[PDB]
Each structure stands twice: as C-alpha cells, then as structure tokens.
Symmetry: D3
Subunit: 219 residues, 6 copies
C-alpha cells in the first residue's frame, strides 16, 4: 500500500517564474530520462525480482523517485503560475495545455512506457537502472547549465546528487551478484566466438586487444 | 560511407518453417531490445563521442549489429516463407502484413526511437549500451528457450554470445575512463546528500550500509 | 512525499495460475482505462487545482489508485509464476517479456500519457475523471466476466466497487461547484447558437427538444 | 453513406495571416481535444450503441464536428496562405511540412486514436463525451485568449459555444437514462466498501468524504 | 460542410459471425492501409492543392473512402454481434474493448496520423496516393484470402476493386501534369550525379542501372 | 554483411554553425521523409522481394540512403558544435538532448516505423518507394530554401538530386514489370465497378471522363 504526506522532500524556492525553463524541465517530469521513468522502471521490476534485498532496494529507490517527481512538478508549477499574460509563457506549450506539469517532455511528446528497460533477470534490470540513472543525471546537468535562478539550480543539483547516489546503490547491488564487472549473465552457455572483435569500421584499445579479445583486423 | 556484401555472417539453417516463432523473433528485428535498437543507438552516439577510440568501437559494433539484424531478418524470412496456407501462419501478423521481417515487435508495435538511450556524455552512452546489451541477451535467452529447431537455436546462441562479447567491450571502454565501478561522472559537483539512503519502503545490503551510505531508517 | 508499506490492501488469493488471463489483466495495469492512468491523471491534476479540498481529494484518490495498481500487479505476478513450460504461458507476451506485470495493455501496447485527459480548469478535470472511472469500471466488468477463479474475481469486484465509489466522489466535488448538471463552465461567454440542435443525420429526445433546444430539422 | 457540400457552415474572415497562431490552431485539428477526436469518438460509438435515439444523436453531433474540423482547417489554411517568405512562417512547422492543416497538434505530434475514450456501456460513452467536450471547450478558450484578430476570435467563440451545446445534449441523454447524477452503472453489484473514503494523503473535508455520502477513514 | 445518409452504399450480408476475422478486418478500419488513412490523407491534401480539378477529385475520392470506412465498420459490427459468449470472441480484443469497430489495427495498435503521407507539391501528394492505394489493395487481398464466408468476401472484393479505380484516377491526374513517368518535379535543378548508379551492394543489372538511363558505377 | 568506411561520400563544409537549422535538418535524419525511412523501407522490402535484380537494386539504394543519413548526421554535428552558449543553441532541442544528431524529427518526435510503407507485393513496394522519394525530395527543397550557407545548400542539392535519381530507378523497375502506368496488380480479379467515378463532392478531367471512366454525376 502507498501513502503520501503533503510536504515535499524540501522547500521549493525560485525567483521570477521562467516558463520557457519550465518547459525544458518537463524532461524530468514526463520525459525519457525523467522521474516517472525511474519510479515506474524500478517499481515494476520489483514484482519479478526474487532477491528479497534487491527487491526492497528497488522499492526504496522507486518511492524516492516519486518524491523527486513531486519536487519537479512543484518546480514546474512555480515557474508557470500566474504568468499567463507574459510573452515568454505564450511561447510555451503551457499556453495551450494549461499551467503546471503534464506527463510530456520538453518537445510536447507524451510519456511512453517504451522509455522503460526491464524484464526477465535482475542483472538486466540493474544494468538498465544504471543506464537510467546516467540519463537522468545527464539531463539534470543540461538543465543546471540553463538554470534561471539560484534556488532552482540548488534543487536540480540536489536531484542530480541523488541520481549519483542511486547509481552507487545499483552498482553495489550488481557487485553483490558478481555482475558489475563480469559481462556474463543468464543461463545460456556461450559458443566459441565470445572473444572475437571484428574491425568492421576502418583504433585499438582494451576492448579489442589481448588478453581479452582476438582482433579480426580484416573481416 | 556504408557498404554491403550479400552473404550473411553465417549460413541460415532451420527446420520446418515455424511462423509463430518467427513472430516472437520480431523482438530482435523491430523490438526494443533488438538489433536495430543496438545498431542505431551505437551509431548515433558515434557522432557526438569525442574519444576517437571509443567512437571507432561504437562504429565497429554498430556495423556488427546491422549484420545481426540481417541474420535475424533471414531467420524470419525462412520461418515465414511458403507457408501461407498453414493454420499456424494464418494466426500470425504475417498473414496480413506479408511474409518476411517487418520493423515491428512480437506484439505488432512499430519500432520507435523512444527505445534508444543516448546523448550528452560518453559515460552515459556506454552505461546505456551495457543496458541495451543486457536486454538483447535476455530476449535471445527467452527465444532460445522457445527454439523450434536446432539450427535456429544455434544461430540464436551465436547472437547471444556476441552480445556478451559486446558487453565486455563496453565494460572495457568504461573501465578505461575509470567509470565502470565509480558512480560519479559529469561536470557538476554534488551536494552534501550523496551518501544518504532513505528507507522509504518498509532489508540491508552494501547499497544501504556502512561504509558507503548513511542509512535513514525512518525518513 | 510518498512512502510505501509492503502489505497490499488485501491478500492475493488465486487458483491455478492462468497466464492468458494475466495478459488480459494488463489492461488495468498498463492499459488506457487502467490504474496507472487513474493515478497519474488525478495526481497531475492536483498540481494545478487551487481548491484545497478538491486538491486533497485528488491526492487521496490517486494514492488509492496506486494501491490498486499494486493489487493488479500482484495478481498478474501470481498468474504468471512458475508456469513458463505451459503452452498457455508460451502463447502470451510474458514468454518474451518475462513474468510479472509490465506497463503495457493486453495487446502489448506501451502505456502512453495520451491516455490522460487533464488541464486548465477543475471542471474539465472532474468531468474527465468521471469518464476515466467509467472506462475503468467497464474494463473491470469485462475482466470479471472472464475471470479464471473465485479469488481473482473477488479482488476484481472490489476494485470495480472502488471505481463506483470514486465516481461518486468526483460527482460530489462537481456538484459542490454547481457543475455536475450545468453544462456551462469557463471564462468565455457563449454566442446565440448555444441552444440549437442541427439534424445533420427521425429520432427525438430531450437532447433536441424544448425546453432545452431549438430543433433545426433541415440544415 | 457520407456526403459533402463545398460551402463551410460559415466562411472564414481573418486579418493578416498569422502562421504562429495557425500552429496553435492545429490543436483543434489534429490534437487530443480537437475536432477529429470528437468526430471519430462519437461516430465509432454509434456502431455499438443500441438505443436508436442516442445512436442518431451521436451521428448528428459527429457530423457537426466534421464541419467544425473543416472550419478549423480553413482557418489554418487562411493563416498560412501567401506568407512563406516571412520569418514568422519560417519559425513554424509549416516551413518543413507545407502550408495548410495537417493531422498534428500544436507541438507537431501526430494524432493518435489513443486520444479516444469509447466502448461497452452507453453510460461510459456518454460520460466520455461530456469529458471530451470539456477538453474541447478548454482548448478553444486558450486559443481565444491567444487569438490574432477579431474575425478568428469570433469563429473560435462560435465553435466553443457549440461544445457547450453538445455538453448539454450528452447530459440530457444521460439524464434520460437516470445516470447523470447516479454513479452506478453496469451489471456488477458493489461490495461493502462502496461508501468508504480513505484519507491516504494527509485535514480537508468536503461532501466527497463526509456523511451522508461517505464513511470517512481518517487514518488508513 | 459534411452530411450523412443512414444507408450504406450496399448493406452487409454475412454468414455466422466470425469475431477473429472481425479483428483482422480492423486493419481496414484503424490500420495503416485502411479507410481512415485514405479518407484523411486525401481530405487534408484538398486544403493545400491549388488545382481546382484535382482538389475536387481528392474530395470526391475522400468521401467514397469515408463510405468504405462505414462499410468496414458495419462488417466488423456484424461479425462481433451476439457472440460474446463464444470462445472465439473471448480470444479477441473485442472481449476487453467491447463489440463493434474501434480505431485500432488487427494488432490492437491505435491509428496514428504517422500513417499519412502528404504535403507540399501536388506531385508528391498524388504519388503518395498511388502508394496508399497499393497498400490498401494489398491488405484487402490478404483479407479476401482469409475471409470467413462468401458475402464478406464479395464486399471485400468490391472494396479492393474501388482501390484499383482510385489508382487509375490518381495516375490520370498525374499524367494530366506530365508527371506519371517523369521522375522530376519541384524547383531545384539536379546536379551532375543525377544519372549515376552506385553498385553499393555486391552482379545484377537491369534498366534501373544500365544505359541509356544510367551510368553504372560498378565499384564505388 | 555490412561494412563501413569512415570517409563520408563528400566533405562537410559549412559556415558559422546554425543550430536552429540543424534542428530543421533532423527531418531528414529521424523524420518521416528522412534518410532512415528510405534506408529501412528499401532494405526491409529486400527480404521479401523475389526478383533478384530488384532485390539487388533495393539493397544498392538502401546502402546509399545510409550514406546520406551519415552526411545529414555530419551536417547536424557541424551545425551544433561548440556553440552551446549561444541563444540560438539554447532555443533548440540540442540544449537538453546533447549536440549532434538524434533519431527524432524537427519537432522532437521519435522516429517510428509507422513511417514505412512496405509489404506483400513488389508492385506495392515500388509504388511506396516512388512516394517516399517524393516526400524526401519535397523536404530537401524546403530545407534548401531555408539553408544557412552555401556549403550546406550544396550538400542538400546533391542529396535532393540523388532522390530524383532514385525515383527514376524505381520507375524503371516498375516499368520493367509493366506496372508503372497500369493501375492493376495483385491476385484478385476486379468486379464490375472498376471503371466508375462517383461525383460525391462541377470539375472534370481524365480521372472522371471517357475513355477511362463512366461518370456518375449524381450518386
Ligand atoms: Ca514538438
Ligand atoms: Ca510526438
Ligand atoms: Ca575499427
Ligand atoms: Ca498487439
Ligand atoms: Ca502499439
Ligand atoms: Ca527498505
Ligand atoms: Ca437526427
Ligand atoms: Ca486527505
Ligand atoms: Ca548491386
Ligand atoms: Ca466532383
Ligand atoms: Mn530522481
Ligand atoms: Mn535516480
Ligand atoms: Mn546483436
Ligand atoms: Mn550487441
Ligand atoms: Mn482503481
Ligand atoms: Mn478509480
Ligand atoms: Mn467541435
Ligand atoms: Mn462538441
Ligand atoms: Mn477504400
Ligand atoms: Mn482508395
Ligand atoms: Mn537519400
Ligand atoms: Mn532516395
């Protein structure tokens, strides 16, 4: 069962409303790398993850992501409230969709569950979550670069910081399985080609060198 | 510039056509975890990755994924050719869309670029690619469990094996950046909350224990 | 702030796992009339509804819908557990996506926020919510008719009951505004054609008769 | 069978072409709350509604919405006509998609039938139609606020007015069944929790969580 | 302005209801190659086509496609009528979405305007329409192969026949402009590579890569 | 088997980076009429086209379209490089998605395979391809009109030229089958209404006149 207390995870503090910025911020409300993606991805995984500890962790983090979604929603509300008459607002999708957050991204695309990567095996799920967190942190960085005021910026820095934290959580979980630095998982024995690297576009590195790989220079 | 030689990466060998299986196999042609997703994800990343070595690696692997896409296409062609009159075929989407592969998944959904995770920073891209590979390997495992004949199975095992190989390539690339086992990347200094773990759903593990985290048992 | 208790709102009791029914039940997990649609529609509205009482009501109901989502997910989990060798399971999308719920409908479509109807005016939102509850109730009735065992049916009858409850709540909120049975709302004065009915397609009712309307028999 | 007369229900009259506004107007052409949504929703319902009176009503209204769609199309055409040289036009999706209406919304999203709400019981359909009309009216109000000239505004006011009329029609149909203010419909009897209100977000009270209608559970 | 007569162009006659076939038939209702696609594509083009003859043709054909859509709808209704108890019906999307047509394809995908191809030059539009008709015909052929009874089949044969007629109409319109067999259109002159064929996949030859039309580059 | 040479088919030469134009150019990268649509449409057709000559032609052209896709991507890269402080860049989707191409259109829509028209009969495929080339040519013309500098324009004029070339190839293939100017194709005999024209909307042309048609003036 889910419950809600009405206070956000911390105070929403901003300067003058900047609705063009609010539109960019929709990325982290209803966009691919956003808070709904994170919350729903981790929560839906929890239904098929058999490891009780990792299942709990997924639920703990998912609930935090819902709190982040709320914070982002409150930021968008603050940056789109009471500025109907401004040229800035009239240039945004809020002018036709209404003020406040909506489950779409900065380009007006409806959130889709096609954004989610999950299923089958906890190792796939955790690797997917490390990727999700990387997209979330990246988008927060871009938004921070475009910050309209110091209060908005500090909130975004906090949210970004929490995705680094989550990344570390997922890495610890994967490492506990022995699968953070080992490529192999699942139940299928590989064939004899696992070490081959084909030079199909024609650079050397650890990804195509001894000891790990047999380099095929001219496939 | 791209080029094509008409022989596939190895011989397509199957038993009797199994078009219901061919429909499942569409996952790896036009589905989320499929070969187009992999090829396009890695290829589009190569345009914004500044590291010359990793850029080449992305292109090398992308071109292999296109060859995998071809192999999967040829498998679907073989399992849907010349069986128009069979009850099995009439129950599949091929009956109305035509024989052979199409860029949709096993449920008939059109492939969408919403399946892709990419942008901004090579560390995000590589983490996204490790996730993509995990989804691809997972789906191949499910398809192997449902294999209609030994020849089809061996091809799928080969493709699965190559995604383990790619996973290792991406892990080596990330490790060369120092970012396979370190959660932090990007250009934003975190705030003071990076070590906090909130017990919001109420299990202990390395993801919420000392030394790494300060456990908040009752947020 | 959101928080989570691990007990669902009641115990999942089913008979023999029925994975084909589990796929049908996805309608109420990731489908248009499902629990995610309800939760997200009412929650996102709460960010722009200024009446404190109605804002709170929307949040109270949204959190219940999240609990419903959990119940539905647990039913899908139960009906897809340890049956992956059965022909029934192999005929479902779970065979390639993995056991348990996914944010898709019964046809394999990814959930999309295009399913939501929200924005601008609390009267629009509440009418949208009465419509959403009607779709939810409808779908639960169809699932009840198709239910595989008594325990599953019982849970669905409860879920259906709560959507009748929610309908009444939304009606009471609308009536409190004088807008349950008054068609007019918003800030634009109607012109002189407001009470006209054009017979563009001879059936008669209070939707095209005095005292409500002037009937144009031949436009 | 369908037919078409080449005259719209009233001819367009606009000021200077405003292609940025034309893009906003796409919301009522190919958007969620737009005229195609209304027309297709009511028309597709007419196939499975057994009540002859309500079936006819749905078809009557669906045909009017198709005329509204044409009107909006003509407005968009007028506001993107002979202005392809202007910086305004170059800033809009018409610069790459061509002049005139397209079945997209103001954000360039393709119209999708995921916007429709229909199926099963006539009560579900009528309640969905009251909701669609509310959305349609709302969008027209925002477009009226943003409108470029008086002629365009007057047309949008007319279209908005007709959605208020349609709302009333759907309300009268529902009331004709006794289901306008009765929440219950369908063939499943509610269980014993039907009158409970759970205070899951916490203290605001109203008729939605107070007697006589509800038993309030203050601490679930 | 649009109008509607309640009689379809010919009334349905089917055998036993076949709801699995009804689901396949959704392809021509809410699918990519279906009647809504054809109707909306030709209608939306009519707003930006300046040639009066071709504009009228597009509207003429668009109205026929709307009648086709109605016919397909009625077929789907007939094939999902009074069979909700049957195992066949329970296996179809109608069991959860309700009887009758829905703006979905045979796979349960919502119709999307991404299925449309339109904009800019009349030649682009007419070539898109020849392609849409080819897709429409193709899907009807597959449905005819799969058809459940003679009455249903005969209707689908008729609909297919009309798409052949429409193809001819679009071809005659294009030919009327001299652009049926002339690849060039628009206002940009081709550069010097216009006649080159690159053998990028390798040796098959045909009129598409041989003189007189092309200079063949055997090893790019 | 696919392989890749790193030289694009010609050198990217632009003037000052113009990120707003780069966003427009996305139409031909991830948009409906773009290069990915062309490449994937012709390639996927090649799996079910049995005429060896036409199969090969489809593959020859598809590989060229992939080279075009690369050219377009390199143009977008060039026009979004090292300008992220400019107000122009900050107004584009690149500001939150990262520099360089993405598989989206100029409106931020994810590419979808719903853009493709393919299946069943080589005549359907070739007609679909003539239509795709027309859309591609149209979009290139609009971009040329909007081009930011001479070098960019030059590349676009070349790309446009090749779509005229491709159109001619598809016409020659169709004509080789006798189906460029013959409306009829497929395996179903037409009924007796095939030469009728209904005047459902008084303009006349060879599309509703003898010798081709019998004109029904009043249906
Ligand atoms: Ca957009
Ligand atoms: Ca979109
Ligand atoms: Ca290389
Ligand atoms: Ca499906
Ligand atoms: Ca779909
Ligand atoms: Ca916990
Ligand atoms: Ca009437
Ligand atoms: Ca409360
Ligand atoms: Ca060749
Ligand atoms: Ca005419
Ligand atoms: Mn977060
Ligand atoms: Mn996170
Ligand atoms: Mn692969
Ligand atoms: Mn791979
Ligand atoms: Mn519910
Ligand atoms: Mn509810
Ligand atoms: Mn209307
Ligand atoms: Mn209306
Ligand atoms: Mn038709
Ligand atoms: Mn046609
Ligand atoms: Mn091209
Ligand atoms: Mn081309």
């Amino acid at each position: 069962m889910v419950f809600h207390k009405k206070e956000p995870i911390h105070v929403v503090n901003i300067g003058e409303a900047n609705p063009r910025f609010a539109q960019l911020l929709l990325e982290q409300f209803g966009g691919a790398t956003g808070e709904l993606s994170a919350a729903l991805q981790y929560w839906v995984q929890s239904f098929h993850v058999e490891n009780a500890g990792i299942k709990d962790m997924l639920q703990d983090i998912a609930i935090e992501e819902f709190s982040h979604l709320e914070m982002v929603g409150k930021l968008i509300e603050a940056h789109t409230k009471n500025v109907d008459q401004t040229e800035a607002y009239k240039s945004t999708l809020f002018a036709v969709r209404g003020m406040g957050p909506h489950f779409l991204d900065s380009q007006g695309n409806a959130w889709t569950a096609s954004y989610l990567n999950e299923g089958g095996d906890v190792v796939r799920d955790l690797r997917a979550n490390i990727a999700a967190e990387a997209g979330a942190r990246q988008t927060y960085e871009e938004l921070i670069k475009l910050s309209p005021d110091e209060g908005t910026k500090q909130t975004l820095v906090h949210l970004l910081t929490r995705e680094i934290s989550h990344t570390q959580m997922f890495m610890k979980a994967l490492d506990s399985l022995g699968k953070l630095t080992d490529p192999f998982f699942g139940n299928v024995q590989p064939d004899e080609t696992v070490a081959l690297y084909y030079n199909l576009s024609s650079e050397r590195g650890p990804w195509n060198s001894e000891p790990a790989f047999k380099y095929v220079a001219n496939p």
